[PDB]
């Protein structure tokens, strides 16, 4: 299965997700001090062919998305700052997200 930039990161506090947008990317003008999730990178590890129904249901009821590996990139420890710009580039044919 391919990798996604969804914002539905499991096994993480809601305060860490509060910095992300509805897509999974931090807003423009958000302060970060320590290692914090600023992109919602997920990688499937188990079963493939996730049906969209159960996909959206995991965000509402039932269990969470196991095939994630929590591969969301974070800023290194010690470095701080405020994000000021985002640049997204997609492969030809792949549907762009709303931030693009």
């Amino acid at each position: 299965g391919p990798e996604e930039i969804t914002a539905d990161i499991p096994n993480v506090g809601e305060a860490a997700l509060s910095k992300l947008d509805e897509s999974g990317i931090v807003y423009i003008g958000a302060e970060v001090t320590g290692g914090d999730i600023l992109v919602g990178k997920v990688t499937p590890k188990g079963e493939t062919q996730l049906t969209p129904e159960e996909k959206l249901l995991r965000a509402i009821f039932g269990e969470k998305a196991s095939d994630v590996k929590d591969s969301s990139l974070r800023v290194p420890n010690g470095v701080s700052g405020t994000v000021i710009d985002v640049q997204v580039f997609t492969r030809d044919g792949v549907e762009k997200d709303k931030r693009a």
């Binding site: 580039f89 030809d92 044919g93 792949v94």
Partner: protein, 49 residues
């Protein structure tokens, strides 16, 4: 917005049609440049295999 006018056609109609031609050509060139810029800024980019 009401360029459509006409009186004493013998020269007025000629000048008005020349100006309408110029206006149409300008608008169409601007629209084509707009579409080219949009297609250039919206096309995807190759990243990696």
């Amino acid at each position: 917005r009401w360029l459509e006018l006409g009186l004493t056609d013998e020269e007025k109609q000629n000048q008005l049609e020349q100006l309408a031609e110029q206006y149409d050509e300008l608008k169409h060139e601007f629209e084509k440049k707009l579409e080219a810029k949009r297609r250039k800024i919206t096309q995807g980019d190759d990243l990696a295999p």
